[PDB]
Amino acid sequence: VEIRAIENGPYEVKIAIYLCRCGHSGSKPHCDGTHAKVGFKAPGAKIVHHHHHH
Amino acid sequence: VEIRAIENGPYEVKIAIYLCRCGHSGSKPHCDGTHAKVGFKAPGAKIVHHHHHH
Numbered sequence: 001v002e003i004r005a006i007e008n009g010p011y012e013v014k015i016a017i018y019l020c021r022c023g024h025s026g027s028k029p030h031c032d033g034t035h036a037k038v039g040f041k042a043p044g045a046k047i048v049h050h051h052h053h054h
Numbered sequence: 055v056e057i058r059a060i061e062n063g064p065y066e067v068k069i070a071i072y073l074c075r076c077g078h079s080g081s082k083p084h085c086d087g088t089h090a091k092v093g094f095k096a097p098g099a100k101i102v103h104h105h106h107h108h
């Protein structure tokens with residue numbers, strides 16, 4: 001399981017789904033690209049990289 | 055691994071961390087409670103409940 005924040009965009013959750021973090025998606029909790037229109041800014045970040053066996 | 059959206063609040067990721075989804079945390083990507091001050095609204099939702107062995 002990998003979770004990262006995309007720069008100026010959604011969370012990517014890979015087990016891929018994209019979760020809104022700007023607050024303005026028309027289809028919460030899934031990102032629909034509204035982040036770009038509202039001018040959301042936040043840097044990329046690694047958040048979790050979990051192997052269940054470790 | 056469990057990921058859920060909290061009503062009017064953050065994503066909860068349990069392997070617990072809380073990820074901002076309103077866009078306005080002072081400590082992105084982590085929730086700091088700003089969602090309540092800005093009046094963010096979104097319902098609760100189950101998103102993933104993954105067992106690596108299944």
Ligand code: FES
Nearest residue numbers: 020021022031034
């Ligand atoms: S982060 Fe993409 S619509 Fe909100």
Ligand code: FES
Nearest residue numbers: 074075076085088
């Ligand atoms: S969801 Fe809590 S500060 Fe944004």
